[PDB]
């Protein structure tokens, strides 16, 4: 289990911060699991002594297939796997954003159809 890290453990957590913030955004846009795990597992409480496993949970919280997760697990370099997890997160971000945008497009268009019927009666 490779667990290499920089002795300058000051600016590295920012990435994890980003990731958790990113992960937060996930649950904000894509409800998958209870936000309670975020509540108890707070990165600012100094309770995450194995941040590699926090990154693993974040990757698991993504919808990445088994192939992408295997590729990530094959990344021993902590920064590289973290950036790959960021890439998967961004992929799912765009996927869900397009899904919600298209659903909203459909619903507004149906509402416009109903309003067009209303206004066709008003035209009559």
């Amino acid at each position: 289990v490779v667990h290499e890290d920089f002795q300058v453990t000051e600016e590295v957590k920012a990435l994890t911060a980003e990731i958790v913030k990113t992960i937060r955004d996930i649950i904000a846009l894509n409800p998958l699991y209870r936000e309670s795990v975020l509540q108890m597992m707070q990165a600012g409480q100094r309770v995450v002594d194995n941040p590699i496993y926090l990154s693993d949970m974040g990757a698991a919280l993504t919808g990445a297939e088994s192939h992408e997760l295997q590729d990530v697990l094959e990344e021993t370099n902590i920064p590289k796997r973290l950036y790959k997890a960021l890439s998967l997160l961004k992929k799912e971000f765009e996927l869900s954003k397009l899904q919600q945008r298209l659903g909203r497009e459909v619903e507004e268009k149906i509402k416009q159809t109903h309003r067009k019927f209303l206004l066709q009666e008003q035209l009559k």
Binding site: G44, Q45, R46, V47
Partner: protein, 31 residues
């Protein structure tokens, strides 16, 4: 003259509303 409150990574900025939560019940009796 009160026992020191276990911060447990709960920074309290000045003039800032913050939340203190400690699993320990020994603080509940003091409260």
């Amino acid at each position: 003259h009160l026992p020191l409150i276990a911060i447990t990574r709960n920074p309290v900025f000045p003039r800032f509303i913050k939340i203190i939560e400690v699993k320990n019940k020994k603080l509940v009796e003091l409260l």
